[PDB]
Amino acid sequence: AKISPSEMSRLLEERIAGWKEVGRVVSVGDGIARLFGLEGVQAGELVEFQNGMTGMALNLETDNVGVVIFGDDRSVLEGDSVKRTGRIVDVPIGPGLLGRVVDALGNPIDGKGPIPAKERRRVELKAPGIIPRKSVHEPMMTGLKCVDALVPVGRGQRELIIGDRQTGKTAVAVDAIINQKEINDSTDDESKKLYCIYVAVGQKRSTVAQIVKALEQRDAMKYTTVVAATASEAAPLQFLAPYSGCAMGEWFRDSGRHCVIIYDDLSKQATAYRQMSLLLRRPPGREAYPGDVFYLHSRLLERAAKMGDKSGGGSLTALPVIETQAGDVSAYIPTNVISITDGQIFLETELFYKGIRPAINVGLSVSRVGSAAQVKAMKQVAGTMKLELAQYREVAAFAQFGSDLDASTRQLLTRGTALTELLKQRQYSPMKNSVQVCVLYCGVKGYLDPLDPKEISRFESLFIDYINANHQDILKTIETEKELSEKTEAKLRAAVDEFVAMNEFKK
Amino acid sequence: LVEKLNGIQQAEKLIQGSLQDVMIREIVSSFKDLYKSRPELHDAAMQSAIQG
Amino acid sequence: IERQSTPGKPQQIDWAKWESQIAHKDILNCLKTFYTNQVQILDRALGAL
Amino acid sequence: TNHGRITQVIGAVVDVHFDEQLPPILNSLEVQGHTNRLVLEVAQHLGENTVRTIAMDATEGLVRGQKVVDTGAPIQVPVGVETLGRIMNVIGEPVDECGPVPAKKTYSIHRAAPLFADQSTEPGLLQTGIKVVDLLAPYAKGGKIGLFGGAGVGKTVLIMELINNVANKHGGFSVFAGVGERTREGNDLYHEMMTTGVIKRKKLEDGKFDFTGSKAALVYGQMNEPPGARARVALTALSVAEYFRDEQGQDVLLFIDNIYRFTQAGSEVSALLGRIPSAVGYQPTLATDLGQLQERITTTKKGSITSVQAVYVPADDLTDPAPATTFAHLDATTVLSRQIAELGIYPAVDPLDSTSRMLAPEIVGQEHYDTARATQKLLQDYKSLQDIIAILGMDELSEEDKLVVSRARKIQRFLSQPFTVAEVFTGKPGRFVELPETIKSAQTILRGECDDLPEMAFYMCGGLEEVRSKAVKMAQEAA
Amino acid sequence: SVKFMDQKRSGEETVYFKKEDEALLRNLLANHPEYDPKYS
């Protein structure tokens, strides 16, 4: 720091000395300007008008230049002077973003203070190449059960969350965010803390405020940031927000830390790109989209990566979100993102209303990484679980017709129903990995087959309270060793036996 | 103690910020008054532009 | 116990930074004196027990 | 060297003006005054000494009036035994971070195909160690092979298994071309080849390297790269292979991942290049842009290139123009299915859509031909009973129909086999099944010697003897 | 109707041939003792 009179005034006095290109707007319409001049413009650079509004130059035609505006076009008047700053569009990075809400360009909208960050980063960047990478070996604890068991997620992955409207997409992401506060509070190792970024494209400010409220109510903002490019926000801001999020996440990825980024309504980005190109008179493709949509999403998703031990060892996981219409995944955007993602998490309304919540279809849903992003203790249970659920899914359709079956098949149906009733969860109620392991142990070793299906929802909670009270040591041992030795196996079985003795259910 | 020092540093920063802010506002207002008041500054600025 | 013996001592604040970064340097001095006066008695009780 | 000036910039398209000596089409231009190297490929002539070009790298940071230098030839990639063991870009630059390519020669990626007078060779049989492949769709040693499938069916996994079971034993060379696939996948392929001796990197005390041995070359035009690069990286790898074919007379292998991206990266720029769109959204110049490649991919009287192309099939729709036009260009075909992959039958090959020019009684004997056709008849009968079973039930079926259904189900289970590459998914070890063993087992199953054996034992068994071993085990644990 | 028929068929076939495979596993080692490791 420094003192005002003797230093700052001298500095400004030394600063004031100075003396001795520009263009003019030619056409204006629909949040877009066409200028004449500025022959020394970089394609993609920031531009400043004579009223404070900003813009981005995209079409460097021969006669004119095509700029997209970050706001309303009432300020531009077909003749206003325009000046280029020379900066490519960039955003601040650092821990000053944690706990804050910002627009597509890093300008805060929380209403509490400016952004204390000194280092910036370019929005559109080259992804990291083949050599500075490694395989995915660490898990990303989502807090859910069916995800963490059957569709695991690693640190460095790019897993899609695809479904219909009102199916639990944001809720899945919010539980993924909420599960991390324990992991972060119970350490000071930044290599182990998981920071989070939530980009919201097309959402309404009421929804974003509800999300911020749900996170503040659970202390889940000191390790997150939010990037709100809502519907009133212009098309270029909606189109730029996810690249800004990836720029904010590359600081973690490169600085040895970890991160997760959730693009919410990733189809509104493509809508905005269509809008921009069609108002820039670019010709469309199919569904009126351009052909550069693949190169629009590939640039973005290839920034998620797991770096090597020479580049710090960081990671940036990605969890894009997509809304389909009538379950049509034969469309263009779903097809592109499935062809450029490391997995899928499908969500259905039939399963959402049948009683399965989260309504994850574990057949279509996959994760190419798979067990490598899974703990051994969870592998042991989840292999059997996947096998049993495959069998149940095969057999239940024929079983429902009232036929009479043997015991080897009745056991399949019973175990499948038990697991299907176990994997249900309330919203904003995530669980630790050790507790998931214990619950799925109870479900897999047959301590729920005779029990009634409707009673499992309270079996689960009572067992959770029981093991949290009297058998925390088993949980700590599983959390540390990350496996199930015979000792922990026996201790857990004994705890379950004590619980079933102490308690009584309808069967 | 660390949180105390972070708070006091931030307070000092905002102090110096507001200080230079008002120092500029007031210098600007003083010049906007003196220019419109005095006749000499007009021809002085004329000569300044000419020689510039 | 495990918590307060896993990191060991990563805090270890250094007044060389703050004496420079701060302009008052009138209450900072008394505060630092308090700090070193409490840390002395802490290490005293530690070595005594 | 000529000199030109950028006139306008639109995405991956750059219009350039020269004062004299316009360059021919497909020639390469270098941008001067840029951060990194930036190459442009001519595509059109517009008049007034103006041309239109496609950029290999991103146009971000480009300015109008920036200067451009013509090279007098298209993108020339280096060639020799010095590219072996090494990774290269579309423009020949290495991206393995091991040094520059000390090649004594370069070839233009744009060449003319071998004429009709340069004939093929005998339809040599290729042994992969895969059962359904070796039986129903035999792969040719000197002909093109196709792996058609959507997303999540095991294309690059099948290619990795083929590489393990062919390239290591191969005495000739091999080339891999990644056209718009994942970078994790590229890293994994490079690591596995360095592990399994397909690449032999030896660092030196003076900071250099030595790739001696290393009978493989790799090329990458991955997703992060723009169009023009995704398009031309296949031509680059194909020139790298044409070098070994023509001059060294070697036998060569050529794996390509997501060739569909080529067409996609054409359609991404066609409407910017002023072409009218064709049907659903691909470009007009699909069949010619694909044929100029495929006809360069062929055996000649100097060498041979066995090629294996993976074809993305969007939404599992084989009526799409790109696969429709690509089926005609292949000697062997292999179509993967989701209805089959859902059953855990891996490889998820549909033997009623897979074909091959080789499956004829004169090439493979009648013991093979009749076995294959009997298998296909059995599987079609089982498919022509699915509705009867779904509606009425097994109670209605005669014992002939029960025996046929059981044989078809057993055959389906028998076809699936574990892979070494899939060990990190399944944990089971991998198998290599020779062709006489496959033919013996299929003849046995069709003759009815093993109908009594249970279907589960049949599943995930490399050989019939293994099936017996698992049935014995299951009976022991049954009692 | 499509997934309905497919899953019904798959379940029925699975059950039927599970029963048949159980029976065959019962009656295998008798009629094929050359595989039985009891005699090896």
Ligand SMILES: Nc1ncnc2c1ncn2[C@@H]1O[C@H](COP(=O)(O)OP(=O)(O)OP(=O)(O)O)[C@@H](O)[C@H]1O
């Ligand atoms: N496990 C759950 N249990 C009960 N209700 C749920 C659960 N998950 C989601 N819901 C409901 O799903 C609704 C939509 O939440 P979300 O923010 O994910 O919308 P969306 O799926 O992104 O669709 P859109 O953005 O178009 O509105 C919410 O009203 C929520 O009540």
Ligand SMILES: Nc1ncnc2c1ncn2[C@@H]1O[C@H](COP(=O)(O)OP(=O)(O)O)[C@@H](O)[C@H]1O
């Ligand atoms: N032998 C196999 N057994 C089980 N699953 C497999 C097997 N091979 C591939 N899979 C799956 O195939 C998928 C790989 O798809 P890939 O061919 O790489 O790309 P694409 O989706 O475009 O076809 C992985 O999810 C992988 O788990």
